[PDB]
Amino acid sequence: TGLLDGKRILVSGIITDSSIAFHIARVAQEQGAQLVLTGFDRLRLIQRITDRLPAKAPLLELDVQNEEHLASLAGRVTEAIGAGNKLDGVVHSIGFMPQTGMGINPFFDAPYADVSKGIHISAYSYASMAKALLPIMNPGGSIVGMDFDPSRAMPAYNWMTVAKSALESVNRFVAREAGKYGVRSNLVAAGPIRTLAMSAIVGGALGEEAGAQIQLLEEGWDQRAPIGWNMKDATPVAKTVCALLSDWLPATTGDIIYADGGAHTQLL
Amino acid sequence: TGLLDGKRILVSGIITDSSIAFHIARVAQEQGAQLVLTGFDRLRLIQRITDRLPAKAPLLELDVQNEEHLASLAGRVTEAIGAGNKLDGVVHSIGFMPQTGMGINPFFDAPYADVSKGIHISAYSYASMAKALLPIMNPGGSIVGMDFDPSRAMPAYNWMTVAKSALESVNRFVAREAGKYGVRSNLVAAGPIRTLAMSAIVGGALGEEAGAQIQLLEEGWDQRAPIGWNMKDATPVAKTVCALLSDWLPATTGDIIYADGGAHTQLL
Amino acid sequence: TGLLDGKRILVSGIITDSSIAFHIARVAQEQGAQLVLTGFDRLRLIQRITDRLPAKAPLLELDVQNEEHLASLAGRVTEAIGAGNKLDGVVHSIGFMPQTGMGINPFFDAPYADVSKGIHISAYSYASMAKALLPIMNPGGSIVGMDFDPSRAMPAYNWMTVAKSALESVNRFVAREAGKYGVRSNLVAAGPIRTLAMSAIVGGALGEEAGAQIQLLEEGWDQRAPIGWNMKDATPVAKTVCALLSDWLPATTGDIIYADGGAHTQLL
Amino acid sequence: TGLLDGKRILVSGIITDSSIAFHIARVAQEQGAQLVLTGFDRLRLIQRITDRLPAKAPLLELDVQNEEHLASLAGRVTEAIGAGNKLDGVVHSIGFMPQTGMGINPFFDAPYADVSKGIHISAYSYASMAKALLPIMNPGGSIVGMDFDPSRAMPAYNWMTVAKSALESVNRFVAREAGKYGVRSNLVAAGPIRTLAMSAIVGGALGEEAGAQIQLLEEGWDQRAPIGWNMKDATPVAKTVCALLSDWLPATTGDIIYADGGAHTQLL
Ligand SMILES: NC(=O)c1ccc[n+]([C@@H]2O[C@H](COP(=O)([O-])OP(=O)(O)OC[C@H]3O[C@@H](n4cnc5c(N)ncnc54)[C@H](O)[C@@H]3O)[C@@H](O)[C@H]2O)c1
Numbered sequence A, B, C, D: 001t002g003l004l005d006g007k008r009i010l011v012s013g014i015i016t017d018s019s020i021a022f023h024i025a026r027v028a029q030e031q032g033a034q035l036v037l038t039g040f041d042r043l044r045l046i047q048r049i050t051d052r053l054p055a056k057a058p059l060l061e062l063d064v065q066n067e068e069h070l071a072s073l074a075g076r077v078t079e080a081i082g083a084g085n086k087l088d089g090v091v092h093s094i095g096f097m098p099q100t101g102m103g104i105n106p107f108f109d110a111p112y113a114d115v116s117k118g119i120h121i122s123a124y125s126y127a128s129m130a131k132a133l134l135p136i137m138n139p140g141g142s143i144v145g146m147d148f149d150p151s152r153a154m155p156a157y158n159w160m161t162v163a164k165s166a167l168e169s170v171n172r173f174v175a176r177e178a179g180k181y182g183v184r185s186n187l188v189a190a191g192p193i194r195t196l197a198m199s200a201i202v203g204g205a206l207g208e209e210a211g212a213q214i215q216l217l218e219e220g221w222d223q224r225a226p227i228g229w230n231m232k233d234a235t236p237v238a239k240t241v242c243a244l245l246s247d248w249l250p251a252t253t254g255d256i257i258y259a260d261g262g263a264h265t266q267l268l
């Protein structure tokens, strides 16, 4: 038993055991929830990884860009959980953006073909996923997607910041749409965690200039954060997503709950 | 056992069983926390009311405006809980403002002697209380005070809005101050609940004009709210304060967690 | 002479004499600025309309979605103004969204092909335009695009809100990009103005089901607005865009200046 | 010509040629605005200070913490300008707060007295000069006092950022109980210019701690602004205030006009 006792919670976005999505699943499982895991394309590969999760959770295939995947979604999920049973949650830990609009390549240069590829998988997909799953959700259910404070412009995040900013706005509209089924829609704003990707830029893969600009940024995050910030530990972020998936915040919708050590409230 | 199992949580602001503070205590108690209740002046009276709380919690006297009360605070509390034991939380459900700056009397007329009386008990007291108690708080502890979205100017709330706006800012500074002890500082923003006071204005005690301006406001709160808003039930607000008092949001500080049905994110 | 004396200011987005862009041009011209007008496709038609502008301003063709148009942009403009002379401003009054995005279309239905068509012309084009023109701008120059407060979710705007929200974020990044040339980037947030089919969004073609929606919106806007709101007059918005184009706000960048009667600051 | 050639304005708050006001005033006094100034506890001081200014304007011994003073804050200016000849501007730059809630003296090391005592000029104040000068004001005309971004918790500024979150909230209600007057009350928030308060809170009377902290935040703002920021001068910031008096920013209220240099909007 536990925080997520008896709840059937869906969790997408696991590609490795460093994924925030992997930690959300691990913690969600410990807390008692029953998971239905979805994976992009490396099905036999990420399968192996989902084997690390304390409990077995049926892996289903889901490319958010494909309406064939979306359509089948609710359907498979039902077979995944059972007939009669419905979903208590949906976790959208999906975020993409080709190097063209994120990082060392300039802001003005990133072409729309890529920007749009990020805005479709990062921002929009939240909607289409709320769209495909909402019907099979019990009232009182919760849908929570990841965010990264787009309020102020920062170097490198460039177009991925813009796609996240669009994400928050979408959150609000899905919120009233989810309202009709009793579901809540919320977004979590974490500080940088070191997934494969971040370890990459850190160690000069991007190079000197970049690896530093981001180093200091991660560095400063700890400066301002009152209870500090531990970028090599996602457990604080997993815990937060689980709380939002519980009966303890039954009134927050179209909202954003920050889990970045409060770094965003301090200036220095 | 439960959400607040084994935690010793302080809860001030109970004057009746309609007080949000009363609900925070009732739920906190059910969830397993051990309470230490503080009361303003009607000690023998509010005592009788705290008797309704599922469990007995030692009532201590606390007038936030009195430095004698503040100084003794930590002290008594220790006797209240025991030698060795420390506090896991502090709940500041205190808010005051003489009718001069709130309601039907105009904004320009409210004199500073009153405005200041509200700003001392509503805004500042959060600090002095964090001041008096912080020392006896275990790291990982949480301090949460009530708020009422001051972002946009609304009729009647007038100077009490201003004092709450000052409150949020104080929250941020106490946040970094609490950081050094491992405590988190957060503010909850609820929509209108009907305590004694609100039932009063509603039923024309203030009169026609006022009783209506507030009626429609409470009315519209439900309009915009996606999962609606039940002003005759504080259970949703109590639940939220308890979650903030738990291990499930270990990274939010100097923050504000809205519990108003998300009415604040929608325009219509 | 006047507010925009001697300044060569570009103004895009004029399709009729109801366009806010038309008013920005009329006032800009009165104030002394020299205009370089751009039109989408109805070149012979909107040409006829630009003839109403107090003074003649060379019409150039510009489809923002076409990199051929963009590339040629700086070039033509130079021939339009002269050799040696540079631009002092750029006004991006461009905004698009097919009825499946906005409309009364259930938000979940709007497919990405359209959403993306709006996000390319509304949000992104701001960038590519700042991209194409920045080079020929004098330091101290100003680029200002239109906005419509996306902070809170409102009915009908749906995906166009999302595109506008993306727009503000882009503004911030163009802001630091423009910084290097001395140019400022800012967005103006107006309340509803009535433009010919926008009179078919209320008491015309689009106000029968969720059509009164833009009534109580067009209505409520005046309620909350302290100095009121006159939706049948764009002069207040034109005046604001000209001030931003002047030497009187030399330090605001990546910012948003609201021109909706302050309706956005009041709750009721 | 001028923005203000012909506009009648009271500019409140001159102590030095180096403090904000002496700036707004020469700039305002040069733009055709005929002004009437206010001074504090050494008017014999602000007197010969003022000769340094561009033309003549009388000095009224005020102090918005004195009520016989507030009492007469209309029919003394009405005596100062014309025999029933009206007034256009209220450029409030009245603000102050004692060194215990300052930086040097720690957040918790201070009491109410002093905070309450500073708000009176800092926060509350704007909600004073308002009522007084109001029915002696002409439509159009504005009420505008300085703001220093309260949003993030600026350590070292402490209570005079909290008072700042409060000046703001109070300027929004004056945005309504003035909007009937067709008057504007709008806040111009700007960055830490080197004035006698700051120029001295470094060179000698505070030794360090708030100091390193302040220079800590000055290297910042500069390094963080797209169009950059200088602090050895206030002129672009003084200008941004002016057009906020003119007819060029016509549709805003209970608003914040930012001339900080785009520093409030840049993460890194
Ligand atoms: N790591 C950080 O610093 C950090 C911090 C806060 C928030 N975030 C955000 O959280 C999200 C997850 O990133 P992460 O680093 O925690 O984990 P991750 O990158 O390991 O997980 C992201 C997932 O995106 C998915 N994806 C991409 N395109 C897809 C598509 N077409 N269809 C279906 N799935 C697709 C992949 O399956 C992948 O598992 C992103 O939105 C990211 O911006 C990251």
Ligand SMILES: NC(=O)c1ccc[n+]([C@@H]2O[C@H](COP(=O)([O-])OP(=O)(O)OC[C@H]3O[C@@H](n4cnc5c(N)ncnc54)[C@H](O)[C@@H]3O)[C@@H](O)[C@H]2O)c1
Pocket (backbone or CB within 6 Å): B012, B013, B014, B015, B016, B018, B019, B020, B021, B039, B040, B041, B062, B063, B064, B065, B093, B094, B095, B096, B121, B146, B147, B148, B189, B190, B191, B192, B193, B194, B195, B197, B198
């Ligand atoms: N009721 C609502 O509509 C509503 C909604 C959201 C937030 N709030 C806020 O929550 C807080 C509590 O109000 P409520 O209606 O839930 O309950 P309440 O009014 O019943 O409780 C408020 C408490 O203020 C305390 N108090 C006043 N001065 C004091 C002082 N000098 N020293 C010590 N204690 C003092 C009293 O002891 C009283 O118990 C206020 O800040 C209020 O603005 C109210």
Ligand SMILES: NC(=O)c1ccc[n+]([C@@H]2O[C@H](COP(=O)([O-])OP(=O)(O)OC[C@H]3O[C@@H](n4cnc5c(N)ncnc54)[C@H](O)[C@@H]3O)[C@@H](O)[C@H]2O)c1
Pocket (backbone or CB within 6 Å): C012, C013, C014, C015, C016, C018, C019, C020, C021, C039, C040, C041, C062, C063, C064, C065, C093, C094, C095, C096, C121, C146, C147, C148, C189, C190, C191, C192, C193, C194, C195, C198
């Ligand atoms: N009317 C209102 O209620 C209102 C209020 C505030 C802000 N706004 C915003 O201001 C902008 C202008 O709308 P409006 O009603 O004032 O005027 P409008 O609709 O008359 O002008 C908009 C322009 O969009 C242009 N456009 C579309 N696609 C283009 C493309 N592919 N390439 C180049 N140009 C293209 C057209 O040329 C057209 O002139 C929009 O962003 C709108 O959302 C509208």
Ligand SMILES: NC(=O)c1ccc[n+]([C@@H]2O[C@H](COP(=O)([O-])OP(=O)(O)OC[C@H]3O[C@@H](n4cnc5c(N)ncnc54)[C@H](O)[C@@H]3O)[C@@H](O)[C@H]2O)c1
Pocket (backbone or CB within 6 Å): D013, D014, D015, D016, D018, D019, D020, D021, D039, D040, D041, D062, D063, D064, D065, D093, D094, D095, D096, D121, D146, D147, D148, D189, D190, D191, D192, D193, D194, D195, D196, D197, D198
């Ligand atoms: N310099 C900075 O750090 C900076 C920069 C931007 C914004 N802010 C804010 O800008 C505003 C302008 O400050 P300045 O830097 O020109 O300061 P200054 O102190 O040199 O001049 C402004 C005035 O503060 C006044 N003041 C104190 N009590 C007052 C009272 N009771 N009556 C009348 N005036 C009162 C004095 O009369 C003094 O003349 C302040 O409110 C400041 O908080 C500060």
Ligand SMILES: CCCCCCCCCCCCCCCC(=O)SCCNC(C)=O
Pocket (backbone or CB within 6 Å): A095, A102, A103, A148, A155, A156, A157, A192, A195, A196, A197, A198, A200, A201, A214
């Ligand atoms: C190769 C990764 C690109 C480098 C990181 C992008 C620029 C970093 C600066 C902004 C910091 C923002 C924190 C966000 C980090 C991310 O979104 S990681 C990308 C998500 N998933 C992967 C592995 O691609």
Ligand SMILES: CCCCCCCCCCCCCCCC(=O)SCCNC(C)=O
Pocket (backbone or CB within 6 Å): B095, B102, B103, B148, B155, B156, B157, B192, B195, B196, B197, B198, B200, B201, B214
């Ligand atoms: C007698 C109460 C005064 C009337 C209510 C104030 C004006 C209501 C309009 C704004 C609505 C805001 C909701 C907030 C309500 C409160 O803070 S109730 C006062 C707190 N405690 C008491 C009983 O005095």
